[PDB]
Amino acid sequence: PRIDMHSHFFPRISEQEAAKFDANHAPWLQVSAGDTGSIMMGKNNFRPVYQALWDPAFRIEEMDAQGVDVQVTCATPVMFGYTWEANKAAQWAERMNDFALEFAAHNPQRIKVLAQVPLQDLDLACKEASRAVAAGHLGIQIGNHLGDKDLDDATLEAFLTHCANEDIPILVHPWDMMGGQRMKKWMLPALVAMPAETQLAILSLILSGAFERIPKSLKICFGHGGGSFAFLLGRVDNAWRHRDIVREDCPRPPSEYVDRFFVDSAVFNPGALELLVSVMGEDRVMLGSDYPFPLGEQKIGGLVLSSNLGESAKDKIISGNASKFFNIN
Amino acid sequence: PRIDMHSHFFPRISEQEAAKFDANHAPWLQVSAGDTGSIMMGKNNFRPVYQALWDPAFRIEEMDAQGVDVQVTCATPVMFGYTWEANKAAQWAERMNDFALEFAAHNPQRIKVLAQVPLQDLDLACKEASRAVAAGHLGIQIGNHLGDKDLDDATLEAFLTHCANEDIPILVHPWDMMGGQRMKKWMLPALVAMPAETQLAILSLILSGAFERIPKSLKICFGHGGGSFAFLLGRVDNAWRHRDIVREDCPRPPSEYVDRFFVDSAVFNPGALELLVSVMGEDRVMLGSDYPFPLGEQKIGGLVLSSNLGESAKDKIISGNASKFFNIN
Ligand SMILES: [Zn+2]
Ligand SMILES: [Zn+2]
């Protein structure tokens, strides 16, 4: 069996549907050619997309071709709405999470969905998380930060702890990338800022001592192999050993906390995957493709399948780990 | 023989010396206890430092203890002065580069120095680079960016090309880190922003096509193992294969340009070093410690010496590569 736990969808939202929330910032889908289409914002074009992003039937055909039995899918991060007024964002989140379940309803045995939450208000976010999971979502996908609040911020740690106590799994996705006016060309935000964003989120939890407070029951996974986290961990441990301000809130070597989280396998390179599995363990890396975006893996699972990891490790990564992490059969 | 090509010094600058340039932004050294001291700016304390940073005699004692035969050293990046008026910055650069040669004069067989340049004015920077090297410097150390100008910017590429045509080697050091108002605690700028800064500098050259224009004669090295560059290269190659805007200026797979630059070995982890050498080749990684700072390597060369790389590879990394790169015996 083969599970892909990192992929995205975008629902068939009309311009008028979106305008009832926000004419300028609520995204919607314009479908033409329906082979091609575009995530729209207001009247401006936001991003060109193709049919698998919005069409569960077409998607199942590609999944069959790729040999993917079960795909876990979740919002495109442009849908997050973290800057909106909280109550409007919560209404948006519930509408998007209902759309997701409608997408999955096409074939709920093979399409699983994770939900978004109005993270700018802890109470509303906790309530939508429980509501979405009760309605059929297998967990939540959040952005890695909320403006200048990183995951060490008590509000975000409290959302994680809520999910832990309710056995709700979390996928953390980089979004709203740092960088200012730099990285204008060649998709540098996706190549530089995204992996740094995810590393920052992981280190924000470790170095703030959040894992000393969050129950071990938390199931939390970081996208894109955890960014650069695994490769730069030796530098973190060395800093921790030599500067008291790095130890202030983190009572043991930072690298020891890798038993508290998961990463997907999307590192697009054999040696990077081997290092990732070295650092994280064969039990904490899960096949994820970033389907259907261009910077995802074209042959889903190809990197893991063609690796020199043992047959046992390949089975956990392509199926066993996500089956346990998301409660899939 | 053993060469450490990444280390820093700070000269015995008095408050009045610095005030003749800028009472508020020119750094200086306050030496007390002389065991301890502090890089000062204006009347405010900037960073606590210890004696090896400013004392060549004391430094030689530690080098003897560590088994370091030759150390290459260069400005502490707070000395760069890239925001200053250009002519004042050029006068500062020449004074700092003279101090560096005075530091090295204590034992020029075992202490080599690289120079700083007033990078905010290409003509003055090119002139100081040639002048410093003529006076005895073995190359130049620059910051990785100049404000919102990264290394793809024609002015910085032109400085690199000048050095290439004059056989002047370059060390590129992360500095003035991205991140805005985030990363306030646990030295996250050094752990997250610095490796991303260096990755951004390397990718700025590759993805802009600068290596198609800069002569192959350029000898250029990136600090801290090149940041996260080597681990995230598979993600870059995949993006390049699937988005035309990533290929616009870079006519072949980005990973093929690793034969155009060097990195130091300071990745503080055995598996990271093995991956680094895999990506870069045993001929393009050089032992560097970041001495004498806390986030440097305590036992200089310990990671390389205790590795499972071949005896031949260990010899290139700890001695042969830098001997050739800097023209040392
Ligand atoms: Zn994604
Ligand atoms: Zn340094």
Numbering used by the authors:
A (entry chain A), B (entry chain A): 4 to 36, 38 to 333
From the publication, what sentences describe this entry?
ACMSD, the enzyme responsible for decarboxylating α-amino-β-carboxymuconate-ε-semialdehyde (ACMS) to produce α-aminomuconate-ε-semialdehyde (2-AMS), plays a crucial role in controlling QUIN levels. This zinc-dependent metalloprotein is situated within the tryptophan-kynurenine pathway, where it competes with a spontaneous chemical reaction that converts ACMS directly to QUIN. With the cavity of ACMSD, a mononuclear Zn2+ ion coordinates with His9, His11, His177, Asp294, and a water molecule (residue numbering based on ACMSD from Pseudomonas fluorescens, pfACMSD). ACMSD functions as a dimer, with residue Arg239∗ from the adjacent subunit being crucial for the decarboxylation reaction.
